[PDB]
Design a protein around this ligand. Sequence first.
Ligand SMILES: [K+]
Ligand SMILES: [K+]
Ligand SMILES: [K+]
Ligand SMILES: [K+]
Ligand SMILES: [K+]
Lengths: 321, 321, 321, 321
Amino acid sequence: NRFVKKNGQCNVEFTNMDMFTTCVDIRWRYMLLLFSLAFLVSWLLFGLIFWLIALIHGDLENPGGDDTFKPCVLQVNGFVAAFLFSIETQTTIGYGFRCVTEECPLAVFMVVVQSIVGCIIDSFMIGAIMAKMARPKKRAQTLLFSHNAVVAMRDGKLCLMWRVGNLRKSHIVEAHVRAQLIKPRITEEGEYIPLDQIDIDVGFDKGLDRIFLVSPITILHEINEDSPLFGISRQDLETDDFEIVVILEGMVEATAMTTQARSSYLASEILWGHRFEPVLFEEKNQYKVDYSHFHKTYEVPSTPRCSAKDLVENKFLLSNS
Amino acid sequence: NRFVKKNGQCNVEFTNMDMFTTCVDIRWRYMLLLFSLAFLVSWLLFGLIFWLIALIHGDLENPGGDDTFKPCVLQVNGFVAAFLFSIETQTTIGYGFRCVTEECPLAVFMVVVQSIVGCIIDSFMIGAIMAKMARPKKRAQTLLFSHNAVVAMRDGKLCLMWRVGNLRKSHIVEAHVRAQLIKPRITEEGEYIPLDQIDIDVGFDKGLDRIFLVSPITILHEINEDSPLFGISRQDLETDDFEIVVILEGMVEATAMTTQARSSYLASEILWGHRFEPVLFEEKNQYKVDYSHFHKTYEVPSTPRCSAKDLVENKFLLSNS
Amino acid sequence: NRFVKKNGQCNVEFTNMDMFTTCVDIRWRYMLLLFSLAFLVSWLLFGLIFWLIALIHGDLENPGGDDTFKPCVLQVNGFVAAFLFSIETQTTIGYGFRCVTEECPLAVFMVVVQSIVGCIIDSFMIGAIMAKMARPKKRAQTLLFSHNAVVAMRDGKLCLMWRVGNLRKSHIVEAHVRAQLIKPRITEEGEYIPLDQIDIDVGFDKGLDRIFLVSPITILHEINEDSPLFGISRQDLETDDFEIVVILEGMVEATAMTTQARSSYLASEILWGHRFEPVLFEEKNQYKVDYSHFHKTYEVPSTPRCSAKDLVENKFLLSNS
Amino acid sequence: NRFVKKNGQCNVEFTNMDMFTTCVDIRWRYMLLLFSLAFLVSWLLFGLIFWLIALIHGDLENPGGDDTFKPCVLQVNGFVAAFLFSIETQTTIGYGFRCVTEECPLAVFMVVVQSIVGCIIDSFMIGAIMAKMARPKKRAQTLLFSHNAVVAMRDGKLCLMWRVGNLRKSHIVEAHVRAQLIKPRITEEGEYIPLDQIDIDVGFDKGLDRIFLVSPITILHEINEDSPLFGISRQDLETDDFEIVVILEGMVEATAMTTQARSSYLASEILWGHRFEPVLFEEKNQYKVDYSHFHKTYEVPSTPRCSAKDLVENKFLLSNS
Ligand SMILES: [K+]
Ligand SMILES: [K+]
Ligand SMILES: [K+]
Ligand SMILES: [K+]
Ligand SMILES: [K+]
């Protein structure tokens, strides 16, 4: 049956799966004690200003008032009272017991200022709880690489192969693969390149490195005359000091951000003479992906143990002589 | 007249169209009962703390006060009264009947704490109603694929064709197409590739797969020596077990996100010997797109019923012998 | 001197320049009357509920209370009073004159519900004033195309040319150009392609279509054997029914979004035998771009009036015979 | 050991490192005095409306009320009192001393209007402190270019080289390089191209310009027959008027935005006959990058002082004659 329904839907089911720009991530909760501190500080500073005004205006001795004396802010009889009035103005609770009167222009202007400072102070709380909220970093790896690489024979050509799989049902827009052999080398003119990176060809010049990754796929690398692996047999493999790196970039629909899945294979991790265990089976009227066979291989004794470079050289005599 | 005005505007009119990172989409409205619950819980817990303080401080028996006794919070005569005071502090309504006094440092600090917890609690409500708001998933498909593929003859070459159309007036930035024949196959060395994906060439090596999709366009695939369709005649078509997948990626101006429109054609869905009904007509001084002829085809009996592989082989004798 | 300082800075100065997913752009201000209406409605509905409770509980006749009778909400003596209490609870002003008492569990729960509905109602106001704010559509065109195309002779090759310029000092990341001749044509097998789009080659196979657009640049299109313009002389130009479209895609640093600048040239708009007036002059120790010469051309009478197809055919005899 | 752990983690340690759309960036803090002004203005205008109502309704002479006279808003005895009531309604503090009564439908409707205007006014404060917060411009350069370019001999080919390094541990998704020689030139038909940009080949046609930039990398440019540097010897270098520009675009994981790192090299800045000092050393069981040797070169006297064009011409005689 269908692999892709007439509307894009993919017919597969997965199974058996296991300045202050640094403020955005200013911390985990050191930001919450930072804000709760921003409050306390402005609440105290203003509680102090109002207490100073109540001190000098002579209110502390006639907090309620007379027909002759009107306080700046009613009921500010001390600092705990001044502190509370301050809090009540900013939080905008304003219980009302402590209340500004129209007596001191200073107190009025102080209430006007604490209202703006207060509105600004928490318009930022929503801006920080916005950065540190709408922008994490531990995006769970949705892409998966086989544990080992395999060199076997496909369609008469000797290739290095490795698997890639989408752990999610979500797609990867404009996805492509890359590989490269990393080993230290000395140039002709005698020069030391510590860790030289050499491209491993997986299809770039024909666009074949562009993949449509629904169910897991096996990535191929034909080992030919132009390969940094051309002259490597199975024995050479259990001795060499090289490492192959594998990348899979693309646009991940889920995290909706351009991704770069990576992984590696040391010569000691690539299994020669093997093949991957299928993972896609058709359960009739729908396909399934037994994600348990993902890293599973299996011997193929009919696989040449010599290098691709020699495999070809020999072919000539048995065609020539 | 003009197809593209001197300022980009396109001269066409369309007609007849039919951790908690999972919190972002934590639900539909199970989040609203989640918040309305976050409230109720903090309102009750604090109402309890204040009621405990009013219990131990001996206020429940003298809620208003004397010249000798001052409660921690005036008018907390019970738990419903304690509950209300709690609510009033956080919501910041503070009617004022229930009011903190400057007596118990504990009660003062409790009001200071409930104000911060409260401000934090709803700074997050705006952060969640922000994720689940500024990031959906049912983005309406703006791209459209013809219902069937067609194999006919254009400019002396035999090609597989299919249509694509932009359902919106909005453009698709950097848009390109891809196709690929999906069928199971056994390799030379005898190996089972369940669902092998084989690229169908639509112009990648010349950049011709890059499209400027205003009015619908017909995508062509010349069936040549290098095609996975090279040896398929019309009869073979009513028997084969293959499926062709079609992708159209690009940057959609509307959803302003990289898209991947898909679709499929089973051998049984591609109409041999046909051609698409035009959809673009010039109503003089402006072009129109009768989107009703989108999936409409029409027979072309002068179309070869043999495969492209044979069509070419024959050409030699009638040129040779 | 330097065109690009050692740190990226570019040494040029410009002168003489002239479901409800549709809710995001739900309107201009029909959204503000939408919210101010959302308020009024919930304020009235609740004012009604509280007035109903005050009606049935018998408060309307004893709004203040006795030592024997306690209202649900003090001072609700009518509907205007009930309306106000409702408003005061949601806005969270709570002047205090109208105040909930701990008498009716219904009234308490009604205040609890109006507080949550109210907090939700305006957490959305910030979410809508967020969509319709952080996502417009009239992004001012920052890219500019010359008014006319020009066909002249450069380095011995006959080319079609047109200008492109960045109206801003900001750069265009990964910018590339494209052109294509749009004209209706009938295929060999006699088929009508209304508006056929034919790629005009500007350097894709060598990557030369990739541009680093600081000061304006002249885009070239060598008219060769492979051009849809190969057989067009100056006379043919004052008769043909073709139109050339020009695109310039890339990532615009300013609008930080993938862009697609467009434009067009009808045969009647491309000036044969011309050349663009320079726009870049070095005012010593800094470069300037007189953006007034942008669309200015100038005759070059030594320019062949015949087509590129003929220009080449002739070259043979005067090299041959 | 490993350069890339089996899960993507990279085994390297760095050391020794030194309309109103313009409102988004409407300013630094001229926006805060803009808002604090938006407040003051609406607070004053409404304080005026309420004072006008209290004037005409005759309240200023009976602010508290009688059993015969009920004010529109209790306690508005002047403009400072009217001003305060206004502030208290919008901020939603509502101390309660100044309170609306159900007498004047006008005053009620005025409180209803100031509540909506007020809620709108600061829903925007969160929208502006959102633009100017979640979108800066001084993104710290994370990419680094060597101070000088070097022309030396690698693997028998004469190349122009320069270094690039990631100043962060974070990766660069889909990263590629570009270079181009910028010099003024006069065309064959005699035409003045002020500052002509000529591509310097760094591997585009094989995809070798695509880099996986972990530890710093040396970018190569083989100077061959096709190079705009083919005919330049060391002497010519201390005379020429050319400048080479270098770009490194890619997707930077940190700023999560498409980047374009730039830099330049005047003929006088490219050191002939040199080589870069290594920067990658293996401290056993982990690699290190001594970022202090980044711009450090060193003479290689065995380096040809003649141009690549001549170096090749000579090779013929000593192979020929
Ligand atoms: K309040
Ligand atoms: K109050
Ligand atoms: K190519
Ligand atoms: K309030
Ligand atoms: K209040």
